[PDB]
Design a protein around this ligand. Structure first.
Ligand SMILES: N[C@@H](Cc1ccccc1)C(=O)O
Ligand SMILES: N[C@@H](Cc1ccccc1)C(=O)O
Lengths: 231, 232
């Protein structure tokens, strides 16, 4: 079933044809052009591969996801955030945020220069966005992802100061569900993500939700760079 | 006559007071801030000036216009589109379409970094939209403009491959007609646009439509990013 793409076409096979093991392996090759990525996210597919490997495309089953309103903020964290030392912005510094996610040296190692450029382009073309957590004047955390209507595909988050991540995920969610936001894609469920409320659902249901929310919208100025949380 | 705009205000003078030669010259100055720009379109005035010159605002008489249903499509173009090698999307890459137009060099030359940013702001705010034409993984054509209700002001189009721009306009028009679209402003008629079916009407006539149509309303999600036409 595994299909190998080419520059000749930006078309992906159907998600349903993905492999079980590894879970979701749908295709390889192609490029990371704005067009190909938009076509991919539009069909519930996303790129993920380690450096040195050809571009690998996925559509796992089940699919990890997170309902905004179902975010789990610990008792200790609400106390922390009630007196948060951070300020949160939107699309003020996409480059630093994804560089942050790339830096750490864990699941962000896949984010190579090539990946960085590709998503930075999407951010400029207006589809990939970032939330920035600030401590004083320095960036200590944040997250970025690709928007798909009222749906948000979370690519990655990073932190250089205690509770910076959660702060972004926390505030983004309030801002998100307050303006029509309906869903966040986590791709594959892990520990940190689970501890935040991420829950699995069937791929078919995810795709069902996907082309249901991609044609929706949020306020015109929702992604306009601005301040999301400042005491 | 004529009029210098002020950073202070954001108001414009009556289009009817514009010059005859050069046809449309109404005012000069101000800036390209979202507000002033948007107000200009409301009033049937648009900015146009060569790099180096001060901002120039226009409202020509007659005004070039294109009734969507009257878009002329040659028989060989129909043949081609039927087996089209192109993909058409909406608001996938506004920045590239405008940059694509700012390179047409016949006269996309007026489109400076200043103009690109100005229209890019309108796009960020949801007033300026783009229609892209893709050949495989390459952007080979498109068009962008400012939405005015059910009226649509075409700013420019570009083409890097045979019939690329004609399919953009063809696919757009279908989409546009389908959901209430009523008229496309073409500003000043030119050989190409005229062959696609564009025509001239009086400025007072155009303004009339503009006022009626700016109140119009397209589906709530008409402009969200999406594919409009997938090749075969
Ligand atoms: N794959 C990402 C999904 C995600 C990114 C950003 C915000 C929320 C979720 C993760 O595991 O963190
Ligand atoms: N002023 C434009 C009008 C137009 C642009 C794009 C699409 C349709 C019409 C031109 O002739 O370049």
């Amino acid at each position: 079933r595994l299909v190998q793409l080419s520059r000749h076409s930006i078309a992906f096979p159907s998600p349903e044809g993905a492999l079980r093991e590894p879970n979701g392996l749908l295709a390889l090759g192609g490029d990371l052009s704005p067009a190909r990525l938009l076509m991919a996210y539009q069909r519930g597919i996303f790129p993920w591969f380690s450096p040195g490997d050809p571009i690998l495309w996925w559509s796992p089953d089940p699919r990890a996801v997170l309902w905004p309103e179902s975010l789990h903020i610990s008792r200790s964290m609400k106390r922390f955030h009630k007196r948060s030392p951070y300020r949160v912005t939107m699309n003020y510094a996409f480059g630093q945020v994804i560089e942050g996610c790339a830096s750490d040296r864990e699941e962000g190692t896949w984010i190579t220069r090539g990946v960085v450029e590709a998503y930075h382009r999407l951010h400029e073309l207006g589809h990939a966005h970032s939330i920035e957590v600030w401590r004083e004047d320095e960036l200590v955390g944040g997250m970025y992802g690709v928007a798909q209507g009222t749906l948000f595909c979370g690519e990655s988050m990073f932190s250089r100061m205690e509770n910076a991540s959660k702060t972004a995920l926390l505030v983004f969610c309030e801002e998100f569900i307050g303006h029509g936001g309906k869903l966040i894609d986590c791709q594959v469920l892990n520990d940190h993500t689970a501890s935040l409320g991420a829950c699995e659902i069937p791929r078919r249901d995810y795709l069902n939700y996907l082309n249901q929310m991609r044609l929706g919208r949020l306020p015109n100025n929702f992604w306009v760079p601005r301040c999301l949380f400042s005491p």
